[PDB]
Amino acid sequence: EIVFGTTVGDFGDMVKEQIQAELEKKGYTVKLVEFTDYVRPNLALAEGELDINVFQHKPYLDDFKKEHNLDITEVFQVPTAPLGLYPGKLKSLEEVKDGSTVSAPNDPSNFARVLVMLDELGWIKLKDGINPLTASKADIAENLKNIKIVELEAAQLPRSRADVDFAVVNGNYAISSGMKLTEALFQEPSFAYVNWSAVKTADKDSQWLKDVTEAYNSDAFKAYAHKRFEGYKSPAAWNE
Ligand code: MED
């Protein structure tokens, strides 16, 4: 029995609609546990409540496992809903004003993504030569449009659109709140945040993980993903 943990929505649908049957064909049973937050899944994995989770990108994982002393590691990538800047009280990028508010996730690896996006938009200017994966407020050279960044817990970002001019929303929460990726005013161009599964390091060589990895890389899964998850960013290894 393989116990998966995912965030609600797209990553759990992948298990229930495609992966689970592929693994049952090989004699496994599958249990899915879903989470509404980003903090519990790696802790449940490390404590043995999960065998594998699918919810995070590698910058998040690298930071989280180091901070909390978790002996876990990434395995394979999965199709991922991209990060986007979405309309809030203002409906178009050209409407940005001096002092416009932008809501952003408050954890460091996802906050960096917002600063890189704001620099790409020309709303702020980051210093030269920084590490984009750890971009922080100290790396801002000039806040060109005096953007006020409103930092929130990531799950709160869809609801923040009533309170801020623009909202930068993680794809999993955008999808699960009924937002459409095509409604974004600007989508992150990077592929560094295509999400990874994670397991306890002790399990990296297990036969069950080999079978899970094959399930997420099958022709059938790719065909399903391309239809069910249009506009998602693909694993690098799919070589699309
Ligand atoms: C926990 S890392 C952030 C969530 C991830 N699904 C993303 O690519 O936005």
Author numbering: 44 to 283
Recite the paper's sentences.
The bacterial periplasmic methionine‐binding protein MetQ is involved in the import of methionine by the cognate MetNI methionine ATP binding cassette (ABC) transporter. MetQ, the substrate‐binding protein (SBP) for MetNI,5, 6 is proposed to play a dual role in transport by either binding l‐methionine for delivery to the translocation pathway of MetNI, or by facilitating d‐methionine uptake through the ligand‐free form when complexed to the transporter. Structural studies of SBPs in their ligand‐bound and ligand‐free forms have revealed a hinge‐bending or “Venus‐flytrap” mechanism where two domains of SBPs adopt their open conformation with an accessible binding site in the absence of substrate; substrate binding stabilizes the closed conformation, where the two domains come together and sequester the substrate. In this study, we report the structures of the Neisseria meningitides MetQ in substrate‐free form and in complexes with l‐methionine and with d‐methionine, along with the associated binding constants determined by isothermal titration calorimetry.
MetQ can bind to other methionine derivatives, including d‐methionine, but preparing these forms has been complicated by the high affinity for l‐methionine. Hence, to crystallize the d‐methionine bound N. meningitides MetQ, we developed an alternative approach by unfolding/refolding MetQ during the MetQ purification to remove the endogenous bound l‐methionine. A sample of unfolded/refolded MetQ was then mixed with 10 mM d‐methionine prior to the crystallization. Six molecules are present in the asymmetric unit of the d‐methionine bound MetQ crystal. Not surprisingly, l‐ and d‐methionine bind to the same site, interacting with the same set of conserved residues. This observation is consistent at all six MetQ molecules present in the asymmetric unit. The α‐amino and α‐carboxyl groups of both l‐ and d‐methionine interact with residues R156, N213, and N238 located on one domain of MetQ, while from the other lobe, residues Y81, F98, H100, and Y103 pack around the methionine thioether group. Short contacts to the methionine CB group are observed in both structures, with ∼3.3 å distances observed to the Y98 CO in the l‐methionine structure, and to the Y81 OH groups in the d‐methionine structure. The side chains of l‐ and d‐methionine adopt distinct rotameric conformations for the N‐Cα‐Cβ‐Cγ; Cα‐Cβ‐Cγ‐Sδ; and Cβ‐Cγ‐Sδ‐Cε torsion angles, which are approximately −175°, −175°, and −70° for l‐methionine and +170°, −80°, and −60° for d‐methionine; the latter values correspond to −170°, +80°, and + 60°, respectively, for l‐methionine. Consequently, while there are differences in the details of the binding interactions between l‐ and d‐methionine to NmMetQ, a qualitative evaluation does not identify any obvious feature as dominating the differences in binding affinities for these two ligands.
